[PDB]
């Protein structure tokens, strides 16, 4: 037996779709106390097809983002404006946690491999993710308000939010670009 | 070190329906130390704090006066 | 897995835990007045869902925001216009 | 169920006297996993009658007071000497760990509420405070050594010890200033 | 619950000493120790007895006279008679 | 980095019953990387350490040469 | 009971020989969550004869290393060069983890006692040490590789790699200096 | 305590952990690429066993190298010679 | 902070055989604060990476082309 192995099968998949897949490895400690230091970190993996778009989310970890294969276009929103950067294969930046983005693939033939390292600090071990976006999976974490909150805070009728942002649209988190 | 009041400087939100005071680490000495954000809330009755998160700190609010109507989304 | 809400009223003396990247709103049901203590505050920054200055989500481009919302990017858009004030508002039904 | 709420009923009283209370809330991660990050920090509040005084003991851990309501008088013991501080509603300040101090309420209509924030170091959310005034619920500490260290350390009788420093004096760790 | 802990350390023995614990040894015989203190950053020694850095003689006595039985003057005095400082002589 | 010695600086404490050699990390580099604190405590047979205690550091005390009697109080 | 006390007997001893011996001391938050703050720190001892020397090895943690009694010659191995260091009773001195080590008692009629406070970061509560030695004890690290590699990598046939570094030559880890 | 060897052969997407002060090495079995990611960084500093260049056991003096290894001092320092290479060599049988 | 390359600096080790890209915590401010190290590995078929270890840093290696024979020594 091999504590330090970690294979691809060990890695569940939090989202899979035609476009593309997120998945996340099991944590470092999980079969072995021999890894206790590495307890706070979590490993993902992206990959996506030719122009598609993961929707824009924020997590509640810092991610340090790794282009494997491909090319990317990413875009940090802040709440002043927005910043836009072009990734190339081996490029790496820091995203940090609550800052809400999304990843698009332009290219139109190379698909994209991203490598994500999250350094989780609000629950040791644990990376979750608020996509803005309803989908079967899971529905827009904003609909979890109730709909008097809803109507003060954007100062409109229910049924007019509901329709134009709350309601299931997308059929998963990766869709593609037209 | 000395004492220091926490609205000694600007609200960082002022309206008709509430006001925000926050020292953070970066400009209180005493608090880098800690690592610690001290804010004071303060809300006319009927006024709604809009939907928001903070970003990297785990906030923990203290009701002094008055009740409050608070709505908490997570993932667990 | 799943997503849920966490509401409750809170009388003067009660305390309430708010995890960061948890969005979160209150309402001030009497004149009301808190104090918070934030941990792991180096940096912090707010973002605000509604309202008019620093709404992230006014600064998602058209183009995307018709994607990611049922709505088209022109709703969306007007949507998050209708709302004036920013940070605190009127919380009349 | 909410584990994010914390009610005046789950404040474990330390020590209530008609002149005023202590009372230390819950670890945050007592009854769940899901704030492992609040463990080192423990909340106490502190309310005290018009002119009384908290007798002077050290604490374990280091403390964030915050005035609440009234106005209140702190003086920080140091082996060189003392500082006295006139808090205000609103005023914070921090105590070091260690550090002997007292609390004293001068208004005369008024009460004292205080918020008191610790964050521990030597035993995780576990808070200790020093009295050096034996009462009923407690002996002063000074009184834990043997009659031998006792009388060599402040070269005097024991009994003469005993009934000037050792002896159970207050009801209360709260009193009333004259 | 308050508590002692006492007992009689032969060489090459180990005592671990919390912080914020009040402690005093005696030398049965002539003494040598190592000390590794942690979180050492901004440590302070408070001395309970003796003439220097005694933080109960820095009470002033009207509170002194408040937090023990006997009065601020007694307690002055009681606080006054040993001369020394950190060491004594440890005899009964 | 090169060696130092416990008693390398004057004694923080010295009496006729006892010494005390105190380096904090402080007054040295490489205890400071560690937050480490290193003492020698030289006493004459009879020689009482009176009652005091450490606001922040936890000793960890080494019988080296001799015998002694310690007196803990703790708060459990 | 008194959990804050540590006995000799409560040293393990690591390596014993006719020349010197080695003892780790348990964990100090092996039978008390009492000292949960020390956890992280592990107190070894070293003791040894005339004329005697600890084969280099390299240690997994931070090393306090302090002279308690004698006289030694220390001497950090770079993979640079070296550096040689007299230390005499009451001396003190950091050696990197990673950094391999040899200890010597230059001494000959004077033993050697030696202090030793580990940092560990690895794996907390955790330290090891690697002998570059074959001993009955345990073999060299070195053989642990396949032949393909160790006959690569020194570019050298096996056998003469085996008889040359790997074949068990001493006894133990503390051997007698000339 | 009993010394292990962790074997194995990786495959795109496969991951192994290396924890600090362990020997390790690699042979690419085809061209190889590997991204590498190590925590606990700061002043971490990569000691070798082989090669000519950085090679900790070539800096052990011949006196105590002949008291450590079961050969000769002479011996000893004349193997770690024969490798001309440091840190990438021929993995060739 | 801006998007950096691992290759962007030149290779710490180059050889006939593989080269090795690092970027330390000490040269770049957005991995000082995570107190991370990053690195790239290519090696020709047939290279053989000699047995070493490091010091202070626990590395995760991944696998992004080809086929690897790691052998690692643990106690």
């Given at each position: 037996?091999?504590?330090?192995?970690?294979?691809?099968?060990?890695?569940?998949?939090?989202?899979?779709?035609?476009?593309?897949?997120?998945?996340?490895?099991?944590?470092?400690?999980?079969?072995?106390?021999?890894?206790?230091?590495?307890?706070?970190?979590?490993?993902?993996?992206?990959?996506?097809?030719?122009?598609?778009?993961?929707?824009?989310?924020?997590?509640?970890?810092?991610?340090?983002?790794?282009?494997?294969?491909?090319?990317?276009?990413?875009?940090?929103?802040?709440?002043?404006?927005?910043?836009?950067?072009?990734?190339?294969?081996?490029?790496?930046?820091?995203?940090?946690?609550?800052?809400?983005?999304?990843?698009?693939?332009?290219?139109?033939?190379?698909?994209?491999?991203?490598?994500?390292?999250?350094?989780?600090?609000?629950?040791?071990?644990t990376v979750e993710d608020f996509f803005l976006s309803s989908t079967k999976r899971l529905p827009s974490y904003l609909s979890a308000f109730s709909k008097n909150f809803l109507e003060a805070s954007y100062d409109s009728p229910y049924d007019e939010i509901e329709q134009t942002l709350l309601q299931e649209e997308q059929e998963g988190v990766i869709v593609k670009m037209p | 070190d000395k004492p220091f009041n926490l609205r000694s400087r600007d609200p960082i939100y002022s309206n008709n329906y509430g006001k925000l005071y926050e020292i953070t680490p970066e400009k209180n000495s005493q608090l880098r130390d800690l690592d610690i954000l001290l804010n004071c809330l303060q809300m006319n009755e009927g006024a709604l704090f809009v939907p928001h998160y903070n970003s990297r700190a785990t906030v923990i609010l203290v009701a002094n006066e008055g009740r409050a109507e608070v709505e908490l989304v997570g993932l667990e | 897995?799943?997503?849920?809400?966490?509401?409750?009223?809170?009388?003067?003396?009660?305390?309430?835990?708010?995890?960061?990247?948890?969005?979160?709103?209150?309402?001030?049901?009497?004149?009301?007045?808190?104090?918070?203590?934030?941990?792991?505050?180096?940096?912090?920054?707010?973002?605000?869902?509604?309202?008019?200055?620093?709404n992230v989500i006014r600064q998602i481009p058209r183009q995307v925001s018709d994607l990611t919302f049922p709505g088209s990017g022109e709703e969306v858009e007007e949507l998050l216009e209708n709302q004036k004030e920013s940070y605190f508002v009127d919380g009349q039904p």
């Open positions: 037996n091999n504590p330090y192995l970690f294979r691809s099968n060990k890695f569940l998949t939090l989202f899979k779709n035609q476009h593309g897949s997120l998945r996340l490895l099991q944590r470092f400690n999980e079969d072995t106390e021999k890894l206790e230091n590495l307890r706070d970190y979590r490993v993902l993996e992206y990959c996506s097809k030719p122009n598609t778009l993961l929707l824009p989310h924020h997590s509640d970890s810092d991610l340090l983002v790794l282009v494997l294969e491909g090319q990317a276009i990413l875009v940090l929103v802040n709440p002043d404006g927005r910043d836009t950067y072009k990734l190339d294969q081996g490029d790496a930046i820091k995203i940090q946690a609550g800052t809400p983005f999304y990843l698009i693939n332009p290219d139109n033939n190379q698909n994209l491999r991203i490598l994500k390292f999250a350094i989780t600090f609000r629950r040791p071990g | - | 897995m799943q997503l849920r809400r966490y509401a409750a009223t809170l009388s003067e003396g009660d305390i309430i835990v708010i995890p960061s990247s948890f969005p979160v709103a209150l309402k001030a049901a009497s004149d009301l007045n808190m104090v918070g203590i934030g941990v792991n505050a180096e940096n912090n920054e707010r973002n605000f869902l509604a309202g008019h200055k620093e």
